[PDB]
Amino acid sequence: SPTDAWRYRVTWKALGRCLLVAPPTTDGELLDGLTTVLSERGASVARLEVPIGARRAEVAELLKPSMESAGEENTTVVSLLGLVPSTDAVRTSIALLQAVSDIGVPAARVWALTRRAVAVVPGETPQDAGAQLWGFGRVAALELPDIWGGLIDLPENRRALELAAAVLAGRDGEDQVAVRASGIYGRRVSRAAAAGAASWQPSGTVLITGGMGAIGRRLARRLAAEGAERLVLTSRRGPEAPGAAELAEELRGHGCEVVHAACDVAERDALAALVTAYPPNAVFHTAGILDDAVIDTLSPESFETVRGAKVCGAELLHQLTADIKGLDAFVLFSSVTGTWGNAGQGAYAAANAALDALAERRRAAGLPATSVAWGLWGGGGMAAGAGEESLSRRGLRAMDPDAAVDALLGAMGRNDVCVTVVDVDWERFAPATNAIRPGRLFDTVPEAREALT
Template identity: 30%
Template sequence: MSPLDRDATVHAIDVVGWFEQPSLTMDRCLQDLQKVIDSGECRPVPHMVYSADQIYAAMDGVLAGQEAGKTVIVLDDGVSLDRAPEQPVLDPTATYLVVGGLDGFGAETARHLVRRGARHLTLVSRRGTARNQDAAALVSSLSDQGVQVDARAVDISDPKTVDQLFRDLDAGGRRLAGVVHAAMVLDDDEVTDLSVERYLTVLNPKLTGALLLDSHTRERNLDFFAMYSSFAALLGNRRQASYSAASLTLENIARQRRHDGLPATVLQLGAISDAGYVLRTGITSVMSDYGILPMTSSQALDRLDMLLHHPDTTVTAVVAESRGHEQALMAFLPAVTAPRTATLVHTSDAGADDSLLPRLRAAATAEEARPILLDALTSWLASGLHTTPDRVDVSRRIDQLGADSLTATELMGHIRRHTGCAIPAPEVMTASLTSIAATVLHHLRPESQS
């Protein structure tokens, strides 16, 4: 505000109001502005341009306050925005503990840690290797690769047994560098049919085990502390109340550790096709019928790699998209259509189908067509605002509802694709959905103006 030092007067002008009504004066102003921009007389504000593959460097500069003016990302054709998984390099002199690491996906995790450089593993499960051929084969395979494996039977929910486990780890003389909590027990049923004992059967290994691991590692210099949760914690499952509760509590434990400056990551796992419970029980096809498409253990462990290399995410969902099975998934888990998870099903917006324009033209009158169009507009805007249509006030200007220029552009795109009407941005940004509907209907049905 240095001009005030020279006794200048500053006026605030609401230019948005200029666009609310047609104005020849405003049209001339915009034309004059376009001329000085085209001639080069009016130069862009200071800015830095980055290509799409430099987006992380651009954001780092913004966060560090190193960029002057605007930061622009150029989206060139053929540029991938997916960050390739980076492989973490583990400490070959340290020990890594995998709870539930002798079976299923926990065993795949143990193999994965070895591929990333681990040479000393402590793998525990309730049974250990006794009467467990798969566990014995795992230990033998890893040992043949030169890995030192300590496989033992441990009830991770028993404080005395866990105390002894950590005393033995300390006696080994190596730093405990990482913990993966993969233990789980399932006992699915309706809530009304679950006894206290059945609840505890599920809660103890997952929840109590996590609490004990947390308390025993708080004073240790860990590189990572990863816990396997379930996508049931994200979406719910009426027959997995106990498992969902345990999984949600893992997230609270992780957030508390992060708050205390300690490492913690939770992976909300979906169905794994080639290891663990889904494979063992042979329900891969059943899960697919429900719209829950399985992913491979390799795909899930790629996400673990990303989190270990960039441990800035506390909770992440590791699930396959449900393309082609959206209706089945929504019938099985209705909550998936909530704004935070709607991208998993890729459903088309309500009213955003090819029948919209024929339905508008088939309406007997403009008044009959108006609610059809308004429903579509409301759905499109709600999607852009990450909310539900019932929370959109159609009588308020969309910028007052929280729509920015990008949201308005997306809404204009929907209108153009599904009605063929190209509406100027100012007429969309500063208008209510009711007003926008009237404008579209005027283009489609001139009699609606009367």
């Protein structure tokens, strides 16, 4: 397939005065353990307590006195807020970064520690809370290069904590490492295998969220035209949506039966009622909202508005289809923003990062699921903001709608769990992305290591 050159994936290549920030009495041991390991490396440790739920203004007040205590000296902030499995932790973690930027303390590195955030070895799966932070973390690197340090995933302690400290004082810009008994691993993006002649053919009832969106409509026409027996489309306005009636009529012309319903995607009753009346054999989650707000202006409300349709939607579909044995397809439309990173879209990257983890957790649990981290989408309909605008200049090209759909069907054939399908001019991305923030992330890409000097 001509789109096999767009397939990438995430693999794991086995590779001063600190301020440990942690939730109210998170664990006397850990704090005592880290202090020791860090100090034995020429570090002057000073712990701070920041409760989950704390907002930026509050966090700024708690950090203010310890950050300015270093003056010109660099303060390496080691955050343990991510060890708490909750979205509140992610919210408070974002707040911590925002606060550090606000205090404007010259010289500072923020490192976010997590656990089970990413699955590096067989058996372990990515838990939501941690996966979200890594997503946001990558956006921070690009938005605040001089402030953001990196992400380190702990085993969850002698050598483990030891390796962790090494990463902090590492010589290589490995701002995405996973510490395991086997050792430390650095996140890498490598071209994925080929899809070839592999493809997927629709049958039975197909549920499509965000069906009145640019992707939604396109997906529907293609499915209905290729064997779908029934399509169930959900949208914010429902059948009263623009051209809703017109679209459904053309879709039934393919022989496919079509039903349209309204929903907030995250509304329980509305989705449950729908899968009850029309048990799906395949689910396609394209719902979501355009996000473009830099970290300094990322409000808590915006973070919720962004994850609502995306995260909440997929999680509800995950639970409402626990007894549906006929379900043999669970497709989540992610974004490359949550796998590679992209400035101005921190809330969007956290959300998409979560769709991917859900895919991983589902499959490893014997449940069908596929998560594709899309790049820029070709064609009519597709609204672009500051975020798409940034990816564009960096070297991403708008994939052809139809080609993109083929890539989907191709990925679904291979039965992928997570894959990045993006069209990129590496001879323009590698150098650009490196000018903002240097790193080892894309070194595993041939065309990337080429433009690099």
